[PDB]
Amino acid sequence: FRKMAFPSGKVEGCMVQVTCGTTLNGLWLDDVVYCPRHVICTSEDMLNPNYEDLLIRKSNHNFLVQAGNVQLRVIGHSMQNCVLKLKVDTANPKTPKYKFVRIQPGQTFSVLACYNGSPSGVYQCAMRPNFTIKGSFLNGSCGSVGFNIDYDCVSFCYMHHMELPTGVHAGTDLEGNFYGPFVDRQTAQAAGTDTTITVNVLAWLYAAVINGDRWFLNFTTTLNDFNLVAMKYNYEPLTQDHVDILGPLSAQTGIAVLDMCASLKELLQNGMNGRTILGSALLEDEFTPFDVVRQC
Amino acid sequence: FRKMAFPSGKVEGCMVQVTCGTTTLNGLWLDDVVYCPRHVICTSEDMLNPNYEDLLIRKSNHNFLVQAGNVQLRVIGHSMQNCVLKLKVDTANPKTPKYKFVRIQPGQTFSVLACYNGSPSGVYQCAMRPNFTIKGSFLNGSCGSVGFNIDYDCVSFCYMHHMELPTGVHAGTDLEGNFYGPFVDRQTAQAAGTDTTITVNVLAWLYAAVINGDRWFLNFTTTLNDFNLVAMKYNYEPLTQDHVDILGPLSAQTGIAVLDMCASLKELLQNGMNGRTILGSALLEDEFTPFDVVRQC
Ligand SMILES: *[C@H](O)[C@H](C[C@@H]1CCNC1=O)NC(=O)[C@H](CC(C)C)NC(=O)OC[C@](C)(O)c1cccc(Cl)c1
Ligand SMILES: *[C@H](O)[C@H](C[C@@H]1CCNC1=O)NC(=O)[C@H](CC(C)C)NC(=O)OC[C@](C)(O)c1cccc(Cl)c1
Numbered sequence: 178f179r180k181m182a183f184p185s186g187k188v189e190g191c192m193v194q195v196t197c198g199t200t201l202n203g204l205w206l207d208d209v210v211y212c213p214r215h216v217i218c219t220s221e222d223m224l225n226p227n228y229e230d231l232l233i234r235k236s237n238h239n240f241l242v243q244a245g246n247v248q249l250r251v252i253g254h255s256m257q258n259c260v261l262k263l264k265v266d267t268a269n270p271k272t273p274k275y276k277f278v279r280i281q282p283g284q285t286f287s288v289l290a291c292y293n294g295s296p297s298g299v300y301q302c303a304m305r306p307n308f309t310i311k312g313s314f315l316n317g318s319c320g321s322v323g324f325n326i327d328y329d330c331v332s333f334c335y336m337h338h339m340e341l342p343t344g345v346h347a348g349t350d351l352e353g354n355f356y357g358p359f360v361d362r363q364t365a366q367a368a369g370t371d372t373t374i375t376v377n378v379l380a381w382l383y384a385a386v387i388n389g390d391r392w393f394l395n396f397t398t399t400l401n402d403f404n405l406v407a408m409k410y411n412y413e414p415l416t417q418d419h420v421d422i423l424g425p426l427s428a429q430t431g432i433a434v435l436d437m438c439a440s441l442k443e444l445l446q447n448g449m450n451g452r453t454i455l456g457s458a459l460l461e462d463e464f465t466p467f468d469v470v471r472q473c
Numbered sequence: 474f475r476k477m478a479f480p481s482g483k484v485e486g487c488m489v490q491v492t493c494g495t496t497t498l499n500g501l502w503l504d505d506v507v508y509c510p511r512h513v514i515c516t517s518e519d520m521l522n523p524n525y526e527d528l529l530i531r532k533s534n535h536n537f538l539v540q541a542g543n544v545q546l547r548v549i550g551h552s553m554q555n556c557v558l559k560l561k562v563d564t565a566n567p568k569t570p571k572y573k574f575v576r577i578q579p580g581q582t583f584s585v586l587a588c589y590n591g592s593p594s595g596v597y598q599c600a601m602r603p604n605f606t607i608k609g610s611f612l613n614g615s616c617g618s619v620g621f622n623i624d625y626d627c628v629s630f631c632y633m634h635h636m637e638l639p640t641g642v643h644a645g646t647d648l649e650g651n652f653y654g655p656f657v658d659r660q661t662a663q664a665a666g667t668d669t670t671i672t673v674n675v676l677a678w679l680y681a682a683v684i685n686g687d688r689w690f691l692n693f694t695t696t697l698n699d700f701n702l703v704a705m706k707y708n709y710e711p712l713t714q715d716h717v718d719i720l721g722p723l724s725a726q727t728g729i730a731v732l733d734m735c736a737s738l739k740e741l742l743q744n745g746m747n748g749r750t751i752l753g754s755a756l757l758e759d760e761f762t763p764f765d766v767v768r769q770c
């Protein structure tokens with residue numbers, strides 16, 4: 178059982194290079210290139226930009242868009258929230274079937290980390306409860322995207338904009354609305370206290386049982402009792418909707434959700450005694466119940 | 474800092490479905506040849522102890538249905554090389570990337586594109602253990618999935634998946650059909666040797682930690698021979714001077730001499746981690762190569 182990203186081919190054919198004076202990545206879908214609007218900023222402009230004013234000073238010819246060894250001509254620009262939409266003369270012949278979606282906290286997605294419009298790596302991320310993500314992003318990584326693949330449809334959910342001072346990351350949906358309270362300006366910004374995605378830890382405990390790791394099973398508890406424990410350890414409260422979402426794994430394993438919660442209560446209170454679970458010494462909360470099923 | 478796979482697009486365009494009788498698995502379509510595991514020609518019963526030559530003689534080209542998406546490829550020739558089957562087909566793959574076949578060394582990493590019925594489902598990074606197993610995520614039907622590195626635009630294929638051992642780890646071949654390790658493609662008892670920790674990789678990960686701000690474990694110094702006596706105690710690979718030189722880039726990026734990083738690692742091994750973490754891990758990680766640490770950092 179591994180942290181597994183979706184295959185990235187469909188998204189690789191959509192990645193392009195966008196330069197204004199400052200280079201980053203764009204997403205080329207049909208005749209539109211989506212990218213973060215702060216590409217129109219200088220080193221100095223980033224302390225507190227007036228984006229509307231800044232964009233007026235810019236002409237299409239100030240936008241160097243490259244798809245591989247071919248330069249694309251921009252014939253129109255517009256600002257939607259924190260993204261720039263650059264209409265180009267050519268529709269992407271590699272455009273997959275796609276949708277834009279705004280994901281919920283606790284959900285996961287694959288990130289295609291890109292630099293200078295070229296993919297360098299792919300990895301699975303979770304949208305944290307505080308609407309950050311714990312990525313691996315260097316300078317130039319802005320405009321890299323996060324996505325899920327359902328059927329043959331690519332559901333784009335994330336475009337990368339910034340690192341916070343904690344070393345975590347923040348970005349928008351593909352309509353340019355930030356996840357969380359963040360703004361695309363280089364001033365101090367606080368992410369809330371984070372929490373552990375309880376439903377995901379349980380999904381991962383089920384993945385452990387499915388793979389032979391069973392030592393942590395035992396006792397029982399009620400949903401309201403477990404939550405009082407969860408609050409102590411900074412775990413998200415578990416709702417009945419979460420129990421139902423875990424149903425499939427419960428049925429594969431014969432282990433009732435509230436029984437697994439009992440085991441998780443013991444692990445939180447008593448720790449791991451030095452044992453491991455699927456080779457990890459910590460509890461993992463970036464697998465959804467969906468991710469575990471998809472894998473097994 | 475994360476476990477990061479290569480983009481899989483180039484390998485996705487090479488995956489096909491290979492069917493022989495009731496068995497179906499994945500094959501790799503490069504130019505006009507499809508590579509796949511030879512046990513595709515085995516029935517349920519044959520797998521205890523197949524005579525692959527005898528089994529393959531019973532097969533003709535038309536017994537091999539190869540599907541690239543909705544396109545059927547016609548097989549015009551077949552041959553066995555070690556534990557892989559090479560099916561010559563009528564069409565060269567127009568999506569063939571620049572590629573090489575390589576046999577990786579233990580301790581090296583690669584990306585796996587896990588596939589079923591010739592369709593990719595996921596991508597993840599693996600390490601070739603010192604005992605020539607890998608800790609993968611493979612289900613039934615995943616055979617013929619491949620492992621690779623990408624340098625520039627060249628795809629270096631290094632692994633094809635064949636089997637799970639009963640301990641749950643995985644084994645397979647290079648693209649010339651030679652197993653990594655002592656394994657054979659038969660369902661009889663098979664032991665992997667004692668594994669060991671890839672010391673140079675743990676050091677590289679400690680460098681990645683320092684690069685990323687995690688410094689609490691730094692300290693003392695030691696000799697290469699002194700550190701190795703500890704390494705031997707803790708089932709760690711011995712550190713050679715070639716390993717020191719390979720870490721040179723990270724030593725220079727951080728100003729920390731390799732032998733100083735070794736001193737800190739001895740302390741971590743002798744005293745454990747006291748419940749602290751390093752890059753968010755409560756264990757020492759040994760599946761990032763120096764190359765992997767650089768590429769990311
Ligand atoms: C776009 O590729 C780039 C990628 C990040 C920089 C390094 N690691 C990254 O993930 N993003 C930016 O350059 C961005 C532009 C702003 C939003 C207009 N700035 C940024 O991320 O600053 C990072 C820093 C230095 O940590 C910081 C400093 C001061 C205030 C904040 Cl909120 C953040
Ligand atoms: C090919 O898709 C398939 C992949 C494995 C099945 C489950 N997880 C896998 O990675 N490989 C095989 O089916 C392989 C075929 C042989 C080599 C001819 N057999 C196999 O993997 O054996 C696994 C098993 C059942 O655990 C076993 C049983 C007895 C002895 C051994 Cl060495 C292995």
Ligand SMILES: [Cl-]
Binds near residue numbers: 457459753754755756
């Ligand atoms: Cl861990």
